Structure 1
């Protein structure tokens, strides 16, 4: 069995290996990369996502989200308070202000310590979940707006044509902006490219151990757990590495820098934080190996998780028994 300790693997494809996206994902899996839940892909030195980032300041962040925490430093929830619209140039200036900027630090490890110690005492503002793309249309390799669609994959594997579309999303971050512990909708893959700016730190639980993280979360968030049998779908709960280690939960950590891709694999729980002003692009995708995870994915039916139009068909075809109850949650 390849990668039996479930370590995060890092790949360096050549420009020739970078042509065929599906083939390269299958290669990484042949080496055991999925067992970690997360892999890093460093693009060939010849590749670029676009020529420059000099002309992005006029993108609008229609609904910036202020991330307000409750709890204790290693075990907390966050809610999102909607703020007034602002442009990317306005948001960059805000990120660089004395109130919001990254503090002085020695290295990534010192910054990680300061994040876990201090996050709860501040409410950073995240420009998350913005439909769009920063890849140039002429970039042919690993262009997240030109991938094979999940609907087309389900059709190729299962023979059923379904409605729905699959487009990328932009994330503009600042120091301390946070992504809570989650897997993807329908336990899909995700791919995330860090276009510019400061790093993003990731934590991940191997898929084979995901239920250990769920059982800890039910213990640590006991009211949430009574409210919903899949409350991590709400994407609100944070648990620190120190707390995970104290409770024996297997995990790994890695920092992504500008110009690097990360792939999350089906049922790989992940969480993390941004080091300073940055922009990332991400999209979900599927492979044949996903189908069995999609059939078994948990679902939130309490009404909180509220998701895209395109998830309807995935539930309806892959999970027909659950369909009725899940749709009640969505309406």
Structure 2
């Protein structure tokens, strides 16, 4: 039941690893979702790509320079768009003295340096690049074709998933940040770190996610006035020192190359890259997600934010609740421990 809500790490055998959907069910049966985030280390024999050398030639169309402002563990970011550059050029930039990882003793030391140096040199990243870099034919844990409930309603029912169930690439360098957020529509996500330096993650248990929202609303009241769901803008940073000071439960873990991270519905997460790296990610859903999607607090202020109609999911997977839901009478409190 994982009542401590701590981030679990799973080490499946190849036999266990072959079927992603069965293994995810197993992870939740052990309470992994209560932490908001879990790590899966594949068996050492498994490789999604035999050789990454040709990824050097991949063009990053719109590299982003991350501009962070603030102090005392509380920051907002904005983005400056740079001219396109290849992965090779990006790697050379990341490894240059201006941008490279500092010397550090251990991951805790590096974390301290991250939070102390956020407002000096602005790092650069590539994100939301369409595509997968798995080899063709890889049938296990293939982020481009996970066969979850999102794919069912798209293929069988003709429902638009708004591109959320397709793969994206992220190229990181030292100090590049992903700000606090849940996924679009409070979906799951899966993240594979193909190569390079690690990625550190913070996660808040879903059963405490409202506490993070209230804390952020108190510290960013202008942001909050402008959008009920302003954390979805992915521009808000809050250090673990601030979380500790206000008693918000959280956990932290570092993802190494070759490891998966799964985020769970309404699992707030944030983090940073240690150095040059490449990750691939997508969103997905299970039936347990549907009650989260029905209640997800959506971005008020900008018109093109991702919105998936929940009607098909209730109709097909919650038939006994469908008419009550459309009546506006399907009122409930989610039990995150279930």
1:29 aligns to what? 28
Distance verdict in 2 for CA 1:295–1:160, change over 3 Å: farther
8 Å CA contact retained: 2:185, 2:308: no
Unaligned runs of 5+ in 1: 323-331
User: Mapping of 1:234-313 within 5 angstroms?
Assistant: 234-303=233-302, 306-308=304-306, 311-313=307-309
Q: Secondary structure at the residue paired with 1:121? A: coil
Q: Secondary structure at the residue paired with 1:282? A: strand
User: Mapping of 1:44-83 within 5 angstroms?
Assistant: 44-83=43-82
Q: CA deviation at 1:314?
A: 4.6
User: Mapping of 1:138-157 within 5 angstroms?
Assistant: 138-148=137-147, 150-154=149-153
CA distance in 1 between counterparts of 2:158 and 2:73 reads 45
Distance verdict in 2 for CA 1:231–1:294, change over 3 Å: same
Alignment match of 2:159 (pick from 159, 162, 167)? 162
CA distance in 1 between counterparts of 2:272 and 2:79 reads 15
Q: CA deviation at 1:150?
A: 4.7
Distance verdict in 2 for CA 1:321–1:202, change over 3 Å: farther
2:13 aligns to what? 14
Moved more, 252-261 or 73-82: 73-82
CA distance in 2 between counterparts of 1:273 and 1:186 reads 23
8 Å CA contact retained: 2:153, 2:312: no
8 Å CA contact retained: 1:229, 1:300: yes
Q: CA deviation at 1:55?
A: 1.3
8 Å CA contact retained: 2:7, 2:35: yes
Q: Secondary structure at the residue paired with 2:15? A: coil
Q: Secondary structure at the residue paired with 1:120? A: coil
Q: CA deviation at 1:320?
A: 8.0
Q: Secondary structure at the residue paired with 1:201? A: strand
How does the TM-score come out when normalised to structure 1?
A: 0.91
Q: Which deviations, in whole Å up to 9, do the C-alpha atoms of 1:212-233 show, x marking residues without a partner?
A: 0000000111110111111001
Q: CA deviation at 1:122?
A: 2.3
Q: Secondary structure at the residue paired with 1:242? A: helix
Number of aligned pairs? 316
2:335 aligns to what? none
Q: Secondary structure at the residue paired with 1:70? A: strand
8 Å CA contact retained: 1:187, 1:266: yes
CA distance in 1 between counterparts of 2:139 and 2:312 reads 33
Q: CA deviation at 1:160?
A: 5.0
8 Å CA contact retained: 1:124, 1:175: yes
CA distance in 2 between counterparts of 1:292 and 1:38 reads 19
1:224 aligns to what? 223
Q: Secondary structure at the residue paired with 1:170? A: strand
1:120 aligns to what? 119
8 Å CA contact retained: 2:6, 2:251: yes
Q: CA deviation at 1:153?
A: 4.0
Q: Which deviations, in whole Å up to 9, do the C-alpha atoms of 1:116-144 show, x marking residues without a partner?
A: 11112221001011011111112111111
8 Å CA contact retained: 2:148, 2:286: no
CA distance in 2 between counterparts of 1:99 and 1:182 reads 29
8 Å CA contact retained: 1:73, 1:118: no
Q: Secondary structure at the residue paired with 1:262? A: strand
Q: Which deviations, in whole Å up to 9, do the C-alpha atoms of 1:84-133 show, x marking residues without a partner?
A: 00010110011011110011111111110100111122210010110111
Q: CA deviation at 1:151?
A: 3.4
CA distance in 1 between counterparts of 2:132 and 2:249 reads 34
Please report the RMSD computed on the Cα atoms of aligned residues, expressed in angstroms.
2.0
